[PDB]
Ligand binder design. Structure first.
Ligand code: ZN
Ligand code: ZN
Lengths: 176, 50, 98, 111, 49, 361, 88, 46
């Protein structure tokens, strides 16, 4: 197709294997937010990889904003080190990529009605609510937001190869 | 607008100036008709605006 | 359709419930209009009685009424709200044949 | 029984209604000095949205979150520059600066 | 709910229409308010001539 | 078949008020006489359905009964045929089979009723915007849309596309410009058929010029009917505006419609530059409406010439020199740890901890 | 409505489906005899592939009848109403 | 196969296929008659 998508967001979770005290980690950290009146989790933000993490007292932690799996792993290790520095036996166990969202462009307009007429069983196009067509391909289980501008957003994959194959499979459908 | 059966009945009542002695009775059946015992009259009228 | 229906509407112009007082539904004026057909999508269209005979439908006119009510103690007025369909007698005042 | 308390209003005559499907959450705009004081509050306290929302009576929490996200997306260099420099927590001078900002916005509204 | 109820959301328009249609077609009139039970009020118009 | 010869060429032919089976080869019958019910008993016999005769229709919760009655009154206030009511109640009973759907609040059930009647009208080519449906619901449109997306993701039923011509036919008739009521001057009255045809031509022009993709249809329809009303009499209607027209028609105007109108006007300009007499006349955004009919006469060649010189949102039509800029490849992570002073920078000092405790004490 | 069931032996419609047109509806102008279908109606039996059973409108009559007109209309319920006016 | 019909007011030959909304161009009438057949029919003058 001559076009390679650009991964923009990576979501991955990791278990620390130990209990945490949210008030302690929120009290001695400058980048920690904790408001138990609304949300019972700690929000932290690491700047160099430009990522944001959610920490729960049950020992689970999740990261968002990464660009690749290696950056997500680095952010998870940084957060584990931060938790360990606050007097907690945090561990880096059960790390697996949960979700990835990427963006791309085709550089030509796309008729959002021909797609829903030819691929009705794979998409739910409603211009009355949202302008972008929502395509749900079942073989890789990928969700795609398509616009008249040609730029397409892909989500639901587990590895970069899945995003690549989804894009290379949806490209002839958009071109046709 | 005139019915087909009524039209055929009206056409049947129209007399023909043909001499009957020069023709013969059609045999039983034979709807195709022969030169001796039948005559054909064509009526084709297409009404249109002036 | 011109006098008696207005008297019937005036006899039951106001209807209210016992619970939640200060709430009411007040009828102002009821109209019968011209006979139409709801064949078109949310669109009325003049239809002849012969077309109603052919299509096996009814030859009626939409009975509408203008009203005023209270939703949240804020009085809201409606100027054109259809409420029924009255079959139109042929050669009547509102019939298309007259 | 109420006496001349409500006024007649014509609304929704039961015709084809436009599908809005938009809830434009009203948000107070951001000024230049307001952006500067928000940046200095971030540099002094960190990324604690609760404390920032507490010291911003003229703002909201969701507005602060949106502003912080847009800043991280656009001016990450200025964000890192503000995060590198530190400043001790000030309370009295902070209230004096709040009163100064109040006077400034009052003068702006007078214009 | 705090969502104020209004009659417009329940103004059934098929009630009177179906009542009139049935009373004219079937020809049986049952008025419980007057206890009137009549039959054969409406008849099919004879188009013999 | 034939009992003697075995021929299976048995034909059903009606005798003199008698039905029987007979073979065409040997003329022998195998079964004569038929048993049919009399209408004298047909009017006496009562109907029995499968659900009521199996035990169903009795395990109907009060909430399910309320939901089906809501479906009934919703399809009745719209004056829908009984087939629409049957299809809607069938779709509701089919969607109520899920455990996650039956266990919900009244708002969820009401927006489900709304989405069910929406799907019902979408099936039989009946255009109906979601706004008119949400109007009759005691809920908001955002949760309605969320539940719609959820149920179309869970069920995956057929959802036809909203036809623009039928939507125009439904939307143009709502205007009071066709009747010379005392609330509107006689100068604004027009014919319904001509206005409908002009609006249909204009919305077709918008469809072929990328003005129905992404944007809501109703503002485009309003802009088209406004241009049609203006072109029907520019001598006495060009001085008006879209707000004046919507106020006179007693219809809530869409907010982006005017902007959409502008875009359509621009399209007209891109057409007016192709026609020789119009490009010599040197029209503008205002004086282009009076020739709209002419633009609709040869719209095909005009839009072909315009596209040979597509339509995109103005946000991206600013000559973007950097399209999808490639980020730098920085997938490195060092050996095991890049640095440790970051942790010392992110932690709170005892003075900062005391200040935080004193601030919200 | 199914088309006329043509006989493969003679490449012509059967005596029962003789008066039917290409659309399965009897065309005006011809004569109708006893035990002849006017509309080749077929209805589904489900209410996975749909199963259609034939329920054609046969003409019960001792004498022959001639078709004067065939009116096809469409109601709001998408139901096609077909009315044939037989003349004797 | 081109199936032809005649409207009720304009009386124009309209070609529509199966499962189409019964309508007619340049109008809105919904009464659609079928044209007379082209087959030969024999009548008796009795
Ligand atoms: Zn035999
Ligand atoms: Zn016509």
């Amino acid at each position: 197709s001559g076009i390679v998508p650009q991964l923009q967001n990576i979501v991955s979770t990791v278990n620390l294997g130990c209990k945490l005290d949210l008030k302690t980690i929120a009290l001695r950290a400058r980048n920690a937010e904790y408001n138990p009146k609304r949300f019972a989790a700690v929000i932290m933000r690491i700047r160099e990889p430009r990522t944001t993490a959610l920490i729960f007292s049950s020992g689970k932690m999740v990261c968002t904003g990464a660009k690749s799996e290696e950056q997500s792993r680095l952010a998870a290790r940084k957060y584990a080190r931060v938790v360990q520095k606050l007097g907690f036996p945090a561990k880096f166990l059960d790390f697996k990529i949960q979700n990835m969202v990427g963006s791309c462009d085709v550089k030509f307009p796309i008729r959002l009605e021909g797609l829903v007429l030819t691929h009705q069983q794979f998409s739910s196009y409603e211009p009355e609510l949202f302008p972008g067509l929502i395509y749900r391909m079942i073989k890789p289980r990928i969700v795609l937001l398509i616009f008249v501008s040609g730029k397409v957003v892909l989500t639901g994959a587990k590895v970069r190869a899945e995003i690549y194959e989804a894009f290379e499979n949806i490209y002839p459908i958009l071109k046709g | 607008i005139v019915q087909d059966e009524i039209l055929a009945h009206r056409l049947g009542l129209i007399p023909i100036h043909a001499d009957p002695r020069l023709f013969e009775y059609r045999n039983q059946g034979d709807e195709e008709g022969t030169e001796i015992d039948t005559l054909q009259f064509r009526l084709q009228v297409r009404c249109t605006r002036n | 359709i011109n006098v008696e229906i207005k008297k019937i509407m005036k006899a039951n112009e106001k209807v209210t419930s016992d619970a939640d007082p200060m709430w009411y539904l007040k009828y102002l004026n009821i109209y019968v209009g011209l006979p139409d057909v709801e064949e078109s999508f949310n669109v009325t269209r003049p239809v002849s009685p012969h077309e109603c005979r052919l299509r096996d439908m009814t030859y009626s006119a939409p009975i509408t009424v203008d009203i005023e009510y209270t939703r949240g103690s804020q009085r809201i007025i409606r100027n054109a709200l259809p409420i029924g369909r009255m079959p139109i007698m042929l050669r009547s005042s509102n019939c298309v044949l007259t | 029984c109420v006496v001349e308390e409500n006024d007649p209003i014509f609304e929704r005559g039961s015709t084809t209604t436009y599908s809005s499907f938009r809830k434009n959450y009203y948000s107070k705009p951001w000024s230049n000095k307001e952006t500067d004081m928000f940046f200095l509050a971030i540099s002094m306290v960190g990324t604690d949205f609760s404390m920032i929302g507490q010291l911003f009576p003229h703002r909201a929490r969701i507005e602060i979150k949106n502003k912080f996200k847009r800043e991280e997306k656009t001016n990450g260099w200025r964000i890192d520059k503000a995060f590198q420099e530190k400043r001790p927590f000030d309370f009295d001078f902070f209230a004096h600066l709040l009163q100064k900002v109040l006077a400034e916005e009052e003068k702006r509204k007078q214009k | 709910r705090a969502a104020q109820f209004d009659v417009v959301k329940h103004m059934r328009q098929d009630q009177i229409t179906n009542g009139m249609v049935n009373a004219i077609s079937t020809g049986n009139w049952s008025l419980k308010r007057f206890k009137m039970d009549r039959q054969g009020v409406t008849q099919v118009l004879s188009r013999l001539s | 078949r034939c009992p003697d010869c075995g021929s299976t060429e048995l034909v059903e032919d009606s005798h003199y008020s008698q039905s029987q089976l007979v073979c065409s080869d040997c003329g022998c019958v195998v079964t004569e006489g038929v048993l049919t019910t009399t209408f004298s008993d047909e009017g006496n016999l009562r109907e029995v359905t499968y659900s009521r005769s199996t035990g169903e229709n009795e395990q109907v919760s009060r909430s399910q009964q309320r939901g089906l009655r809501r479906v009934r009154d919703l399809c009745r206030v719209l004056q829908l045929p009984p087939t629409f009511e049957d299809t809607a109640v069938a779709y509701y009973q089919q969607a109520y089979r899920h455990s996650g759907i039956r266990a919900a609040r009244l708002q969820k059930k009401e927006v489900l009723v709304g989405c069910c009647v929406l799907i019902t009208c979408r099936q039989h080519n009946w255009p109906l915007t979601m706004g008119a449906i949400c109007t009759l619901l005691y809920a908001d449109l955002d949760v309605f849309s969320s539940t719609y997306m959820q149920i179309v993701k869970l069920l995956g039923l057929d959802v036809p596309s909203l036809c623009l011509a039928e939507l125009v036919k439904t939307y143009c008739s709502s205007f009071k410009l066709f009747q010379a009521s005392p609330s509107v001057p006689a100068k604004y009255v027009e014919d319904k058929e001509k206005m409908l045809s002009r609006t249909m031509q204009l919305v077709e022009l918008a469809n072929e010029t990328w003005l129905v993709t992404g944007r809501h249809p109703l503002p485009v329809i309003t802009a088209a009917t406004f241009l049609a009303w203006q072109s029907l009499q520019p001598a006495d209607r060009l001085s008006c505006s879209l707000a004046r027209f919507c106020k006179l028609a007693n219809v809530d105007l869409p907010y982006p419609a005017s902007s959409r109108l502008q875009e359509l006007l621009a399209v007209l300009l891109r057409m007016a530059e192709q026609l020789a007499w119009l490009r010599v006349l040197r029209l503008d955004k205002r004086s282009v409406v009076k020739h709209i009919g002419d633009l609709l006469q040869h719209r095909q060649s005009l839009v072909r010439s315009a596209f040979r010189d597509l339509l995109l949102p103005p946000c991206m039509l600013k000559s973007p020199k950097r399209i999808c800029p490639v980020p730098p490849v920085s997938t490195v992570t060092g050996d095991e740890n890049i640095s440790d002073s970051e942790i010392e920078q992110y932690l709170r000092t005892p003075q900062e901890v005391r200040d935080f405790q004193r601030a919200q004490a | 409505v199914m088309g006329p069931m043509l006989d493969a032996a003679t490449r012509k419609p059967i005596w029962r489906h003789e008066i039917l047109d290409a659309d399965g509806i009897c065309s005006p102008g011809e004569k109708v005899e006893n035990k002849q279908v006017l509309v080749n109606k077929s209805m589904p039996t489900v209410t996975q592939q749909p199963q259609y059973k034939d329920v054609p409108i046969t003409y019960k009559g001792a004498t022959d009848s001639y078709i004067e007109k065939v009116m096809i209309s469409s109601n709001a319920e998408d139901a096609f109403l077909i009315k044939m006016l037989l003349r004797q | 196969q081109p199936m032809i019909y005649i409207c009720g007011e304009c009386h124009t030959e309209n070609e529509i296929k199966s499962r189409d909304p019964i309508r007619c161009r340049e109008c809105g009438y919904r009464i659609m008659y079928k044209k007379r057949t082209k087959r030969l029919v024999v009548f008796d003058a009795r």
